[PDB]
PDB file of all heavy atoms in Angstrom:
ATOM      1  N   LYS K  10       9.946  21.625  13.544  1.00 39.71           N
ATOM      2  CA  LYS K  10      10.040  23.137  13.742  1.00 39.71           C
ATOM      3  C   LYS K  10      10.721  23.893  12.616  1.00 39.71           C
ATOM      4  O   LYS K  10      10.230  24.890  12.194  1.00 39.71           O
ATOM      5  CB  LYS K  10      10.812  23.349  15.132  1.00 39.71           C
ATOM      6  CG  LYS K  10      10.012  23.099  16.325  1.00 39.71           C
ATOM      7  CD  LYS K  10      10.909  23.179  17.556  1.00 39.71           C
ATOM      8  CE  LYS K  10      10.114  23.381  18.871  1.00 39.71           C
ATOM      9  NZ  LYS K  10       8.642  23.661  18.647  1.00 39.71           N
ATOM     10  N   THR K  11      11.790  23.283  12.077  1.00 41.00           N
ATOM     11  CA  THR K  11      12.619  23.981  11.094  1.00 41.00           C
ATOM     12  C   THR K  11      12.622  23.269   9.718  1.00 41.00           C
ATOM     13  O   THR K  11      13.161  23.812   8.767  1.00 41.00           O
ATOM     14  CB  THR K  11      14.086  23.965  11.614  1.00 41.00           C
ATOM     15  OG1 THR K  11      14.632  22.671  11.703  1.00 41.00           O
ATOM     16  CG2 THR K  11      14.102  24.629  13.018  1.00 41.00           C
ATOM     17  N   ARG K  12      11.883  22.174   9.574  1.00 41.32           N
ATOM     18  CA  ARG K  12      11.882  21.385   8.302  1.00 41.32           C
ATOM     19  C   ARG K  12      10.504  20.719   8.224  1.00 41.32           C
ATOM     20  O   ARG K  12      10.108  19.937   9.083  1.00 41.32           O
ATOM     21  CB  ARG K  12      13.054  20.375   8.551  1.00 41.32           C
ATOM     22  CG  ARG K  12      14.410  20.941   7.958  1.00 41.32           C
ATOM     23  CD  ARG K  12      15.474  19.839   7.804  1.00 41.32           C
ATOM     24  NE  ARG K  12      16.778  20.256   7.328  1.00 41.32           N
ATOM     25  CZ  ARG K  12      17.901  19.519   7.418  1.00 41.32           C
ATOM     26  NH1 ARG K  12      17.900  18.269   7.789  1.00 41.32           N
ATOM     27  NH2 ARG K  12      18.985  19.978   6.686  1.00 41.32           N
ATOM     28  N   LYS K  13       9.775  21.079   7.115  1.00 41.25           N
ATOM     29  CA  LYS K  13       8.425  20.693   6.941  1.00 41.25           C
ATOM     30  C   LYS K  13       8.272  19.908   5.536  1.00 41.25           C
ATOM     31  O   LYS K  13       9.000  20.252   4.560  1.00 41.25           O
ATOM     32  CB  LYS K  13       7.486  21.936   6.847  1.00 41.25           C
ATOM     33  CG  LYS K  13       7.271  22.564   8.245  1.00 41.25           C
ATOM     34  CD  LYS K  13       6.191  23.685   8.343  1.00 41.25           C
ATOM     35  CE  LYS K  13       6.527  25.002   7.588  1.00 41.25           C
ATOM     36  NZ  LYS K  13       5.837  26.263   8.176  1.00 41.25           N
ATOM     37  N   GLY K  14       7.434  18.853   5.460  1.00 42.54           N
ATOM     38  CA  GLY K  14       7.322  18.169   4.227  1.00 42.54           C
ATOM     39  C   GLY K  14       6.236  17.086   4.275  1.00 42.54           C
ATOM     40  O   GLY K  14       5.646  16.748   5.324  1.00 42.54           O
ATOM     41  N   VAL K  15       6.000  16.481   3.126  1.00 42.51           N
ATOM     42  CA  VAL K  15       5.090  15.294   2.941  1.00 42.51           C
ATOM     43  C   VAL K  15       5.902  14.340   2.080  1.00 42.51           C
ATOM     44  O   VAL K  15       6.217  14.585   0.943  1.00 42.51           O
ATOM     45  CB  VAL K  15       3.832  15.690   2.288  1.00 42.51           C
ATOM     46  CG1 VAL K  15       2.857  14.502   2.382  1.00 42.51           C
ATOM     47  CG2 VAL K  15       3.295  16.925   2.832  1.00 42.51           C
ATOM     48  N   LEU K  16       6.131  13.080   2.621  1.00 42.08           N
ATOM     49  CA  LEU K  16       6.849  12.068   1.854  1.00 42.08           C
ATOM     50  C   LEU K  16       5.845  10.876   1.724  1.00 42.08           C
ATOM     51  O   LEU K  16       4.837  10.730   2.368  1.00 42.08           O
ATOM     52  CB  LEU K  16       8.106  11.538   2.544  1.00 42.08           C
ATOM     53  CG  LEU K  16       9.210  12.551   2.818  1.00 42.08           C
ATOM     54  CD1 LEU K  16      10.312  11.929   3.670  1.00 42.08           C
ATOM     55  CD2 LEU K  16       9.736  13.124   1.579  1.00 42.08           C
ATOM     56  N   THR K  17       6.110   9.983   0.712  1.00 43.58           N
ATOM     57  CA  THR K  17       5.237   8.815   0.423  1.00 43.58           C
ATOM     58  C   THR K  17       6.187   7.675   0.191  1.00 43.58           C
ATOM     59  O   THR K  17       7.320   7.828  -0.221  1.00 43.58           O
ATOM     60  CB  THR K  17       4.484   9.122  -0.860  1.00 43.58           C
ATOM     61  OG1 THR K  17       3.353   8.246  -0.823  1.00 43.58           O
ATOM     62  CG2 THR K  17       5.222   8.842  -2.057  1.00 43.58           C
ATOM     63  N   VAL K  18       5.664   6.458   0.439  1.00 44.38           N
ATOM     64  CA  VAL K  18       6.376   5.239   0.042  1.00 44.38           C
ATOM     65  C   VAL K  18       5.387   4.137  -0.010  1.00 44.38           C
ATOM     66  O   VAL K  18       4.404   4.048   0.775  1.00 44.38           O
ATOM     67  CB  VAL K  18       7.553   4.927   1.078  1.00 44.38           C
ATOM     68  CG1 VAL K  18       7.010   4.459   2.420  1.00 44.38           C
ATOM     69  CG2 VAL K  18       8.469   3.896   0.524  1.00 44.38           C
ATOM     70  N   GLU K  19       5.668   3.235  -0.932  1.00 45.30           N
ATOM     71  CA  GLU K  19       4.880   1.954  -1.111  1.00 45.30           C
ATOM     72  C   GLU K  19       5.652   0.878  -0.338  1.00 45.30           C
ATOM     73  O   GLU K  19       6.791   0.662  -0.535  1.00 45.30           O
ATOM     74  CB  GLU K  19       4.626   1.679  -2.578  1.00 45.30           C
ATOM     75  CG  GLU K  19       3.718   0.407  -2.785  1.00 45.30           C
ATOM     76  CD  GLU K  19       4.221  -0.913  -2.573  1.00 45.30           C
ATOM     77  OE1 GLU K  19       5.390  -1.160  -2.836  1.00 45.30           O
ATOM     78  OE2 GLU K  19       3.425  -1.742  -2.101  1.00 45.30           O
ATOM     79  N   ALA K  20       4.925   0.142   0.500  1.00 47.30           N
ATOM     80  CA  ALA K  20       5.407  -0.890   1.382  1.00 47.30           C
ATOM     81  C   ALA K  20       4.363  -1.980   1.534  1.00 47.30           C
ATOM     82  O   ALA K  20       3.149  -1.746   1.487  1.00 47.30           O
ATOM     83  CB  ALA K  20       5.768  -0.336   2.757  1.00 47.30           C
ATOM     84  N   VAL K  21       4.883  -3.209   1.672  1.00 49.05           N
ATOM     85  CA  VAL K  21       3.999  -4.366   1.919  1.00 49.05           C
ATOM     86  C   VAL K  21       3.195  -4.270   3.208  1.00 49.05           C
ATOM     87  O   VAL K  21       2.096  -4.793   3.214  1.00 49.05           O
ATOM     88  CB  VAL K  21       4.836  -5.674   1.947  1.00 49.05           C
ATOM     89  CG1 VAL K  21       5.847  -5.663   3.047  1.00 49.05           C
ATOM     90  CG2 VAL K  21       3.919  -6.865   2.013  1.00 49.05           C
ATOM     91  N   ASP K  22       3.640  -3.574   4.213  1.00 47.30           N
ATOM     92  CA  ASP K  22       2.856  -3.357   5.427  1.00 47.30           C
ATOM     93  C   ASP K  22       3.276  -2.023   6.055  1.00 47.30           C
ATOM     94  O   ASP K  22       4.261  -1.375   5.702  1.00 47.30           O
ATOM     95  CB  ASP K  22       3.036  -4.604   6.343  1.00 47.30           C
ATOM     96  CG  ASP K  22       4.427  -4.870   6.702  1.00 47.30           C
ATOM     97  OD1 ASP K  22       5.221  -3.859   6.895  1.00 47.30           O
ATOM     98  OD2 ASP K  22       4.818  -6.082   6.861  1.00 47.30           O
ATOM     99  N   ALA K  23       2.487  -1.652   6.996  1.00 49.48           N
ATOM    100  CA  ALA K  23       2.658  -0.304   7.614  1.00 49.48           C
ATOM    101  C   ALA K  23       4.009  -0.278   8.373  1.00 49.48           C
ATOM    102  O   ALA K  23       4.643   0.750   8.376  1.00 49.48           O
ATOM    103  CB  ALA K  23       1.524  -0.098   8.624  1.00 49.48           C
ATOM    104  N   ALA K  24       4.400  -1.384   8.946  1.00 49.17           N
ATOM    105  CA  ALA K  24       5.704  -1.372   9.745  1.00 49.17           C
ATOM    106  C   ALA K  24       6.876  -1.214   8.848  1.00 49.17           C
ATOM    107  O   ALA K  24       7.793  -0.423   9.169  1.00 49.17           O
ATOM    108  CB  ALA K  24       5.714  -2.709  10.594  1.00 49.17           C
ATOM    109  N   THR K  25       6.873  -1.916   7.764  1.00 49.27           N
ATOM    110  CA  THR K  25       7.952  -1.743   6.735  1.00 49.27           C
ATOM    111  C   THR K  25       7.913  -0.222   6.209  1.00 49.27           C
ATOM    112  O   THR K  25       8.984   0.397   6.189  1.00 49.27           O
ATOM    113  CB  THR K  25       7.735  -2.643   5.590  1.00 49.27           C
ATOM    114  OG1 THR K  25       7.803  -4.017   5.986  1.00 49.27           O
ATOM    115  CG2 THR K  25       8.715  -2.431   4.424  1.00 49.27           C
ATOM    116  N   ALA K  26       6.774   0.309   6.023  1.00 49.57           N
ATOM    117  CA  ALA K  26       6.659   1.675   5.637  1.00 49.57           C
ATOM    118  C   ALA K  26       7.178   2.600   6.793  1.00 49.57           C
ATOM    119  O   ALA K  26       7.913   3.564   6.503  1.00 49.57           O
ATOM    120  CB  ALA K  26       5.215   2.044   5.300  1.00 49.57           C
ATOM    121  N   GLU K  27       6.799   2.279   8.001  1.00 51.49           N
ATOM    122  CA  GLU K  27       7.066   3.175   9.152  1.00 51.49           C
ATOM    123  C   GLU K  27       8.598   3.213   9.388  1.00 51.49           C
ATOM    124  O   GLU K  27       9.166   4.320   9.652  1.00 51.49           O
ATOM    125  CB  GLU K  27       6.410   2.805  10.397  1.00 51.49           C
ATOM    126  CG  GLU K  27       6.470   3.925  11.387  1.00 51.49           C
ATOM    127  CD  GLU K  27       5.622   3.698  12.641  1.00 51.49           C
ATOM    128  OE1 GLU K  27       4.802   2.764  12.659  1.00 51.49           O
ATOM    129  OE2 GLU K  27       5.627   4.591  13.580  1.00 51.49           O
ATOM    130  N   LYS K  28       9.284   2.056   9.328  1.00 48.87           N
ATOM    131  CA  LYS K  28      10.684   2.100   9.473  1.00 48.87           C
ATOM    132  C   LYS K  28      11.410   2.937   8.413  1.00 48.87           C
ATOM    133  O   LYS K  28      12.314   3.739   8.788  1.00 48.87           O
ATOM    134  CB  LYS K  28      11.264   0.620   9.411  1.00 48.87           C
ATOM    135  CG  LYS K  28      12.753   0.537   9.325  1.00 48.87           C
ATOM    136  CD  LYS K  28      13.178  -0.920   9.223  1.00 48.87           C
ATOM    137  CE  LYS K  28      14.707  -1.075   9.556  1.00 48.87           C
ATOM    138  NZ  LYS K  28      15.326  -2.273   8.932  1.00 48.87           N
ATOM    139  N   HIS K  29      10.918   2.901   7.231  1.00 46.83           N
ATOM    140  CA  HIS K  29      11.431   3.713   6.124  1.00 46.83           C
ATOM    141  C   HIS K  29      11.300   5.217   6.513  1.00 46.83           C
ATOM    142  O   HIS K  29      12.216   5.956   6.271  1.00 46.83           O
ATOM    143  CB  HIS K  29      10.609   3.344   4.898  1.00 46.83           C
ATOM    144  CG  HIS K  29      11.118   3.976   3.689  1.00 46.83           C
ATOM    145  ND1 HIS K  29      11.695   3.241   2.724  1.00 46.83           N
ATOM    146  CD2 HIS K  29      11.029   5.260   3.185  1.00 46.83           C
ATOM    147  CE1 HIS K  29      12.108   4.098   1.723  1.00 46.83           C
ATOM    148  NE2 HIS K  29      11.651   5.283   1.917  1.00 46.83           N
ATOM    149  N   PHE K  30      10.088   5.551   6.947  1.00 45.70           N
ATOM    150  CA  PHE K  30       9.882   6.978   7.286  1.00 45.70           C
ATOM    151  C   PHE K  30      10.627   7.393   8.544  1.00 45.70           C
ATOM    152  O   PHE K  30      10.983   8.574   8.532  1.00 45.70           O
ATOM    153  CB  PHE K  30       8.400   7.155   7.443  1.00 45.70           C
ATOM    154  CG  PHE K  30       7.584   7.189   6.179  1.00 45.70           C
ATOM    155  CD1 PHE K  30       6.275   6.716   6.202  1.00 45.70           C
ATOM    156  CD2 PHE K  30       8.023   7.762   5.015  1.00 45.70           C
ATOM    157  CE1 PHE K  30       5.470   6.742   5.123  1.00 45.70           C
ATOM    158  CE2 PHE K  30       7.251   7.794   3.903  1.00 45.70           C
ATOM    159  CZ  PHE K  30       5.993   7.316   3.898  1.00 45.70           C
ATOM    160  N   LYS K  31      10.744   6.612   9.505  1.00 45.61           N
ATOM    161  CA  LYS K  31      11.502   7.024  10.714  1.00 45.61           C
ATOM    162  C   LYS K  31      12.992   7.332  10.332  1.00 45.61           C
ATOM    163  O   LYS K  31      13.607   8.245  10.773  1.00 45.61           O
ATOM    164  CB  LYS K  31      11.505   5.934  11.721  1.00 45.61           C
ATOM    165  CG  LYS K  31      10.149   5.953  12.487  1.00 45.61           C
ATOM    166  CD  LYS K  31      10.183   5.056  13.708  1.00 45.61           C
ATOM    167  CE  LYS K  31       8.806   4.759  14.241  1.00 45.61           C
ATOM    168  NZ  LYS K  31       8.210   6.046  14.865  1.00 45.61           N
ATOM    169  N   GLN K  32      13.560   6.504   9.407  1.00 45.17           N
ATOM    170  CA  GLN K  32      14.912   6.694   8.973  1.00 45.17           C
ATOM    171  C   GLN K  32      15.045   8.104   8.327  1.00 45.17           C
ATOM    172  O   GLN K  32      15.973   8.783   8.527  1.00 45.17           O
ATOM    173  CB  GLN K  32      15.310   5.561   8.024  1.00 45.17           C
ATOM    174  CG  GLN K  32      16.707   5.634   7.465  1.00 45.17           C
ATOM    175  CD  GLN K  32      17.761   5.769   8.547  1.00 45.17           C
ATOM    176  OE1 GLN K  32      17.736   5.025   9.535  1.00 45.17           O
ATOM    177  NE2 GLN K  32      18.681   6.692   8.375  1.00 45.17           N
ATOM    178  N   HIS K  33      14.038   8.446   7.561  1.00 48.10           N
ATOM    179  CA  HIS K  33      13.981   9.691   6.925  1.00 48.10           C
ATOM    180  C   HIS K  33      13.895  10.883   7.938  1.00 48.10           C
ATOM    181  O   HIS K  33      14.730  11.775   7.844  1.00 48.10           O
ATOM    182  CB  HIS K  33      12.726   9.843   6.100  1.00 48.10           C
ATOM    183  CG  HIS K  33      12.898   9.279   4.797  1.00 48.10           C
ATOM    184  ND1 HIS K  33      14.215   9.116   4.283  1.00 48.10           N
ATOM    185  CD2 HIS K  33      12.108   8.685   3.855  1.00 48.10           C
ATOM    186  CE1 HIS K  33      14.127   8.611   3.164  1.00 48.10           C
ATOM    187  NE2 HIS K  33      12.877   8.254   2.813  1.00 48.10           N
ATOM    188  N   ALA K  34      13.024  10.851   8.904  1.00 46.26           N
ATOM    189  CA  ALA K  34      12.937  11.790   9.917  1.00 46.26           C
ATOM    190  C   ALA K  34      14.344  11.852  10.632  1.00 46.26           C
ATOM    191  O   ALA K  34      14.793  13.046  10.957  1.00 46.26           O
ATOM    192  CB  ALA K  34      11.835  11.531  10.880  1.00 46.26           C
ATOM    193  N   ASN K  35      14.950  10.783  10.983  1.00 47.24           N
ATOM    194  CA  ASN K  35      16.241  10.755  11.667  1.00 47.24           C
ATOM    195  C   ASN K  35      17.335  11.401  10.829  1.00 47.24           C
ATOM    196  O   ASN K  35      18.117  12.172  11.318  1.00 47.24           O
ATOM    197  CB  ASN K  35      16.605   9.311  11.990  1.00 47.24           C
ATOM    198  CG  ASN K  35      18.025   9.172  12.545  1.00 47.24           C
ATOM    199  OD1 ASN K  35      18.356   9.443  13.693  1.00 47.24           O
ATOM    200  ND2 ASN K  35      18.911   8.654  11.696  1.00 47.24           N
ATOM    201  N   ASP K  36      17.343  11.043   9.474  1.00 45.01           N
ATOM    202  CA  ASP K  36      18.427  11.658   8.643  1.00 45.01           C
ATOM    203  C   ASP K  36      18.166  13.143   8.401  1.00 45.01           C
ATOM    204  O   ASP K  36      19.210  13.824   8.146  1.00 45.01           O
ATOM    205  CB  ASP K  36      18.524  10.921   7.430  1.00 45.01           C
ATOM    206  CG  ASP K  36      19.061   9.514   7.604  1.00 45.01           C
ATOM    207  OD1 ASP K  36      19.742   9.303   8.605  1.00 45.01           O
ATOM    208  OD2 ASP K  36      18.652   8.716   6.835  1.00 45.01           O
ATOM    209  N   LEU K  37      16.925  13.567   8.412  1.00 43.14           N
ATOM    210  CA  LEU K  37      16.595  15.012   8.261  1.00 43.14           C
ATOM    211  C   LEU K  37      16.752  15.746   9.636  1.00 43.14           C
ATOM    212  O   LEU K  37      16.541  16.934   9.612  1.00 43.14           O
ATOM    213  CB  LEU K  37      15.202  15.162   7.743  1.00 43.14           C
ATOM    214  CG  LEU K  37      15.079  14.833   6.275  1.00 43.14           C
ATOM    215  CD1 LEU K  37      13.607  14.588   5.942  1.00 43.14           C
ATOM    216  CD2 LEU K  37      15.623  15.915   5.393  1.00 43.14           C
TER     217      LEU K  37
END
Side-chain angles (χ1 to χ4, degrees):
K10 283 172 158 355
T11 66
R12 270 197 185 166
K13 291 189 292 207
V15 193
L16 300 174
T17 200
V18 72
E19 187 284 326
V21 62
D22 55 38
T25 297
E27 191 172 355
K28 170 181 196 204
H29 189 108
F30 285 149
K31 285 188 194 295
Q32 181 53 50
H33 279 336
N35 172 78
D36 293 333
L37 285 164

